[PDB]
């Protein structure tokens, strides 16, 4: 099907889906230089503190933590958000080196890997409507950089050995992501899609400033994951990222000056 490879990566992808070279594509290269000042951009409100994770799953792609989205539980508001947009999974995107990994880039430097939180705009009542809607989404996109340990990605590092390979899922309960966030809440915030198939044109992205640290062994275990499933031949899960696509008419916008 589309993959990351050689015959079925990013370069195919328009093929199947020719949203691929639309108007308002993910991800993008933040020009630190270039984007705008905003000072009408409102402090984030990430509000995780009743999120319900319920299981992880090896999707063949990528590996996904879910949650409980049937209520109000983990909620994104403020921003450049208008409504309630609640936590329905978090994945990442990491390299096979630590110099590549992550899809957006900033002054076109390139991270280990990055975090996609995913919210959806509940006015739209599901995910699968959602998608379908130019606001439909927001996805707070934080960037993992090497260096220090960072504690609350252990008990998802850990777990990893229990689905490397696709379809492969496991229960995945009382996980925190307050522990995934870096200090500042700063951001840019940009229009875009998802960066996979399908690549539809309903995400508000929220990339935030400061990266994560994580640890070299962390990422190894990332690195550890199979895009095959079991007894199919293995092919290591790494380079999952879709390269930075061009910007058209679009501005960038960050809460910070
Ligand atoms: N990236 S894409 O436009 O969705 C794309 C490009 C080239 C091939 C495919 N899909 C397939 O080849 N599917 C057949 C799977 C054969 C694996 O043994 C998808
Ligand atoms: N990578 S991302 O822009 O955060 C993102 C967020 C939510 C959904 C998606 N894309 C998909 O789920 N595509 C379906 C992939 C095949 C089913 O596993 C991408
Ligand atoms: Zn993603």
Partial sequence: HWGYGKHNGPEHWHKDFPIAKGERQSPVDIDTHTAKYDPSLKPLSVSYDQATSLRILNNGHAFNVEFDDSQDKAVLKGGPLDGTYRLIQFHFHWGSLDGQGSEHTVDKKKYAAELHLV???????????????????????????????????????????????????????????????????????????????????????????????????????????????????????????????????????????
């Avoid at 006015?123 to 996805?139: H, T, W």
């Avoid at 050995?161 to 200090?183: Q, V, Y």
């Avoid at 062994?217 to 990222?241: H, S, Y």
């Fill in 119 to 257: 919210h959806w705009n509940t006015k739209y009542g599901d995910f699968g409507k959602a998608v379908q809607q130019p606001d439909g989404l927001a996805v707070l996109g934080i960037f993992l950089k090497v260096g220090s340990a960072k504690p609350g990605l252990q008990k998802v590092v850990d777990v990893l050995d229990s689905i490397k390979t696709k379809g492969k899922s496991a229960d995945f309960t009382n996980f925190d992501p307050r522990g995934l966030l870096p200090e500042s809440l700063d951001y840019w915030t940009y229009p875009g899609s998802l960066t996979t198939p399908p690549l539809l044109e309903c995400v508000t992205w929220i990339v935030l400033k400061e990266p994560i640290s994580v640890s070299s062994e962390q990422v190894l275990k990332f690195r550890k994951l199979n895009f095959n499933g079991e007894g199919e031949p293995e092919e290591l899960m790494v380079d999952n990222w879709r390269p930075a696509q061009p910007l058209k008419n679009r501005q960038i916008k960050a809460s910070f000056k």
